Design a protein around this ligand. Sequence first.
Ligand SMILES: [Ca+2]
Length: 231
Amino acid sequence: NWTLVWQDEFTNGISSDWVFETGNGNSGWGNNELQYYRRENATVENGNLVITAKRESIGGYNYTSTRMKTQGRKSWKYGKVEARIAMPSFMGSWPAFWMLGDNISSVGWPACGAIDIMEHVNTEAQTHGTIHWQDHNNTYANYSGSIPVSSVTSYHIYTIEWDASVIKWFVDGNLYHEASIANGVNGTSEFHNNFFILLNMAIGGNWPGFNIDNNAFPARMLVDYVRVYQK
Ligand SMILES: [Ca+2]
């Protein structure tokens, strides 16, 4: 059965297991994103993390938001990883709940692997689940599924179950995507290493595009909790 091994319920502030990124990264966090991440865009209100994207200027960028991670504090190999999230829906928005391989520090992205547990862009009536990696031929690979979500602005539960055979994605317990990692099929060896968790909300970028609804700011993503279980 599933045993809880880590959580942040945000009940008494943000856990010291999170580190915050600052700035626009390299080439907009690799995606030509437009935001500058800060600590100040993360707050807690009534037992929920609140990530607020703002029209705010700093360092040559014109929007701010938060990107937080458990890198260097907490990581896991296999498990059930879940968060209860309510996110905004507007043109330019790109919230995510995801994981990266701890070995990113030595192998870089995308060789480290990423497991996107929840992504949403713009005003789509659906959310996506995806894995990204470098395959047997060392070519960038991704494998993505999606599920209709009529109200991303309401709380939904975004989950993966990950074991040495498979990763499965669920929203509200409804299975919608799955990917085999058994034997490192399609060069998925790196999903058999420890990964850390990230939460963020980007503004603009190659996927959502550069048509930004400037009247949708400030915008809030609320996260009731993040939990990890293992067998
Ligand atoms: Ca909570």
